């Protein structure tokens, strides 16, 4: 089992990370959220494959 990298609302690490991202300029925030959506897709893909291999 692999740890969920962004367990808060699917895109934040924890509350201080949320507050930090929400304080950034729009371009930076949307770039980081895009980065994280890629990380989360790969995490979820690996989780699916683990379920299928059981
Ligand atoms: Na918060």
Task: Walk me through the structure.
This protein has one domain (1-54). The longest helix is centred in the last third of the chain and has 27 residues, at 26-52. It has helices spanning 15-23, 26-52. The chain is elongated, with a radius of gyration of 13 Å. It has two helices and no strands. Bound molecules: sodium ion. Sodium ion (NA) binds next to helix 1. The PDB classes it as transcription. The entry lists the keywords Transcription, Paf1, Chromatin, Rtf1. It forms a monomeric assembly. The entry is titled "Crystal structure of the S. cerevisiae Rtf1 histone modification domain mutant R126A".
Summary?
The PDB classes it as transcription. This protein is mostly helical and 54 residues long.
Helix-strand layout with pairing:
Layout: H1 15-23, H2 26-52
The structure holds sodium ion (NA).
Sodium ion binds next to helix 1.
Q: What is the count of β-strands?
A: 0
Shape: elongated
**What is the count of helical runs?**
2
State the major sheet: none
What share of the residues lie within helices?
55-70%
- Oligomeric state of the chains present here: monomer
Q: What structural class do the secondary elements suggest?
A: mainly alpha
- Rg over alpha carbons: 13 Å
PDB class: transcription
Keywords: Transcription, Paf1, Chromatin, Rtf1
Assembly: monomeric
Entry title: Crystal structure of the S. cerevisiae Rtf1 histone modification domain mutant R126A
């Amino acid at each position: 089992e692999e740890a969920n990298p962004f367990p808060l609302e699917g895109k934040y690490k924890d509350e201080s990370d949320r507050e930090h991202l929400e304080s950034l300029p729009e371009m930076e925030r949307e770039t980081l959220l895009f980065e994280r959506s890629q990380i989360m897709q790969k995490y979820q893909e690996r989780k699916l494959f683990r379920a299928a291999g059981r």
